[PDB]
Amino acid sequence: SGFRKMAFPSGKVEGCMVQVTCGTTTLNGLWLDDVVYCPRHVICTSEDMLNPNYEDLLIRKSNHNFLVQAGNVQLRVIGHSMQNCVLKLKVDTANPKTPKYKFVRIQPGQTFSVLACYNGSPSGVYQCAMRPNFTIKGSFLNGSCGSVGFNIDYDCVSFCYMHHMELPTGVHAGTDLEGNFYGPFVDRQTAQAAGTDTTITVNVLAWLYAAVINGDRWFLNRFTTTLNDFNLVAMKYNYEPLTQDHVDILGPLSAQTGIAVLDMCASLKELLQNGMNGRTILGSALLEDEFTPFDVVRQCSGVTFQ
Amino acid sequence: SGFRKMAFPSGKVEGCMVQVTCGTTTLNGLWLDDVVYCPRHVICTSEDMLNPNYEDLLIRKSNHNFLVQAGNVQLRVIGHSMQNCVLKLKVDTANPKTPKYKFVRIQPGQTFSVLACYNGSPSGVYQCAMRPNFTIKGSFLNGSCGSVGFNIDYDCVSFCYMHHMELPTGVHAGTDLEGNFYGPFVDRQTAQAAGTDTTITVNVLAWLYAAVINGDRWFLNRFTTTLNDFNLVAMKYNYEPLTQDHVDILGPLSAQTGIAVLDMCASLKELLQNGMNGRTILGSALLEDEFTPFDVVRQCS
Numbered sequence: 001s002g003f004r005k006m007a008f009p010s011g012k013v014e015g016c017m018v019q020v021t022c023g024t025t026t027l028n029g030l031w032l033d034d035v036v037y038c039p040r041h042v043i044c045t046s047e048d049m050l051n052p053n054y055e056d057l058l059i060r061k062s063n064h065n066f067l068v069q070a071g072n073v074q075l076r077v078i079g080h081s082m083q084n085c086v087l088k089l090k091v092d093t094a095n096p097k098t099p100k101y102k103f104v105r106i107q108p109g110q111t112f113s114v115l116a117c118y119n120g121s122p123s124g125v126y127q128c129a130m131r132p133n134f135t136i137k138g139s140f141l142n143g144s145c146g147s148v149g150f151n152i153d154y155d156c157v158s159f160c161y162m163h164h165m166e167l168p169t170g171v172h173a174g175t176d177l178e179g180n181f182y183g184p185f186v187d188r189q190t191a192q193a194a195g196t197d198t199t200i201t202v203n204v205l206a207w208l209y210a211a212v213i214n215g216d217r218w219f220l221n222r223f224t225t226t227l228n229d230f231n232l233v234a235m236k237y238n239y240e241p242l243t244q245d246h247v248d249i250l251g252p253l254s255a256q257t258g259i260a261v262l263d264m265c266a267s268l269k270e271l272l273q274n275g276m277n278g279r280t281i282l283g284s285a286l287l288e289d290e291f292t293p294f295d296v297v298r299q300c301s302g303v304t305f306q
Numbered sequence: 307s308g309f310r311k312m313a314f315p316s317g318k319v320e321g322c323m324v325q326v327t328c329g330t331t332t333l334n335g336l337w338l339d340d341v342v343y344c345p346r347h348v349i350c351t352s353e354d355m356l357n358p359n360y361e362d363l364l365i366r367k368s369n370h371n372f373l374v375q376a377g378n379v380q381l382r383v384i385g386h387s388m389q390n391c392v393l394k395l396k397v398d399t400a401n402p403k404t405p406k407y408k409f410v411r412i413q414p415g416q417t418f419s420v421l422a423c424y425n426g427s428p429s430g431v432y433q434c435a436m437r438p439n440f441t442i443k444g445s446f447l448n449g450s451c452g453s454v455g456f457n458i459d460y461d462c463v464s465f466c467y468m469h470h471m472e473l474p475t476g477v478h479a480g481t482d483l484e485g486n487f488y489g490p491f492v493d494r495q496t497a498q499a500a501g502t503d504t505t506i507t508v509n510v511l512a513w514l515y516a517a518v519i520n521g522d523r524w525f526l527n528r529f530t531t532t533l534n535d536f537n538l539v540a541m542k543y544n545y546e547p548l549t550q551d552h553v554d555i556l557g558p559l560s561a562q563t564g565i566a567v568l569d570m571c572a573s574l575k576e577l578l579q580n581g582m583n584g585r586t587i588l589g590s591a592l593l594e595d596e597f598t599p600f601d602v603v604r605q606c607s
């Protein structure tokens with residue numbers, strides 16, 4: 001029992017973190033096989049930030065303009081190329097600690113672990129979700145650019161996020177490992193702002209099922225709802241629409257607990273109406289939305305505490 | 307910016323986790339140098355656990371009663387002994403991945419990272435605190451015994467917790483790596499319960515400082531207080547007494563933010579007395595107490 005924000009063990013990613021320096025700028029890179037991946041804005045100087053032309057900035061660089069440091073070892077750069085907003089530096093040494101890995105682009109609502117790094121050295125690990133507005137609510141200080149997000153289901157590291165920048169509200173924007181931003185954001189320091197964010201409804205429902213699995217039912221009620229009536233209510237609280245895909249995804253948790261998905265929807269509607277009246281759910285006084293259905297199955301017992 | 311519950315990177319510990327089997331019981335062990343550490347209750351049957359004589363059960367056991375598996379490699383057990391509630395299995399091979407490490411017993415209110423493991427395989431990492439009642443609010447399923455908690459200082463891992471049991475309220479109890487329990491608990495199937503818990507005041511204050519550093523200021527007020535007056539309030543609300551040492555430890559955050567600890571205590575005093583008024587602090591509707599002053603400084607600075 002218990003329920004925690006649970007990250008993946010970070011060691012497989014720790015062994016891939018390096019420091020990349022260009023000019024006066026230092027940030028983190030990801031060393032897989034003989035390639036180091038990092039944000040292309042490492043090649044920007046002070047002036048360059050408003051309207052950089054990365055093609056023009058990059059053509060002026062030689063391989064030896066890139067300093068890559070793996071712990072105490074200088075790695076020799078022997079080639080470079082840009083893919084979208086990621087710089088790829090070919091180095092003369094394949095990383096002997098390279099895990100089994102793949103690159104995946106995720107959808108809003110998906111979760112992942114972040115290994116926050118500074119100067120190529122890992123500092124801490126935490127869980128994040130891709131918000132509906134394509135930002136993440138990270139914890140990142142100056143120098144964290146190039147830190148990555150990942151999952152490790154079944155001994156393979158799926159890299160899904162590389163950190164590029166902070167927006168004015170203090171949330172974070174970045175790319176997949178092919179260098180394509182999540183959301184409409186760009187690696188320019190022109191004014192940009194996260195949209196109005198919303199609550200990830202399918203994840204709240206998953207976490208309510210987690211609460212039932214762990215033995216608590218106080219928030220259920222005798223009612224049900226249609227999917228459309230649920231969405232009409234939930235959107236008034238700035239919840240994301242629940243789709244039939246989401247309903248299908250929740251099937252296994254519904255089966256394990258014996259609570260129909262639309263009956264859990266009725267419970268959620270009532271929680272939004274009533275609050276918790278001084279109670280908590282899995283240790284929280286608010287409805288939590290950064291655990292996915294898959295996360296709940298990963299962490300919770302397959303046997304409900306009835 | 308931002309503020310997250312954050313664990314230490316777990317790689318140095320992942321390289322130390324192994325599977326230990328005795329009879330039909332499988333759990334996790336910690337492999338450092340040429341010794342594997344695990345809960346001594348690995349040697350017990352379910353019958354034994356009602357009233358185990360660990361001395362007698364262990365003298366019955368021999369090296370060949372233990373199967374230690376590091377990934378796919380079997381480690382040969384060449385000795386065995388007990389230290390308090392921890393079993394020590396000498397193996398013929400020193401762990402080449404052994405980090406610089408110490409065994410450190412922590413105090414209530416201090417935090418640590420937990421590497422949750424099953425069948426010797428790391429599964430997840432999370433952060434938690436030693437509660438004032440010496441339990442931890444972990445997340446553990448059957449097979450997690452022997453999972454460890456730790457902190458890192460530079461390159462040195464300070465191991466502070468090994469997981470032994472779940473209590474009836476679903477919180478968890480265990481030992482330091484020398485086998486000494488945290489809290490008034492024993493490794494036998496007998497009636498046991500978590501005592502009434504209290505909130506870790508110095509950590510709540512630390513988290514209020516973190517909230518200020520991150521731009522959450524609505525709870526600040528013009529008032530200050532004294533230790534004596536605040537501690538009468540803390541007692542009322544089942545908060546741990548605030549000591550002068552706690553005030554001193556918070557000094558840095560006091561200097562950085564301009565809110566003296568007794569100034570922030572006046573905020574906390576008011577939050578206890580009046581509630582949050584529908585507002586949140588750092589995205590929480592509760593007062594969070596599992597961030598230490600060190601944790602805040604490390605993450606914010």
Ligand SMILES: [Cl-]
Nearest residue numbers: 105106107110
């Ligand atoms: Cl996805």
Ligand code: NA
Nearest residue numbers: 527529569572
């Ligand atoms: Na004040």
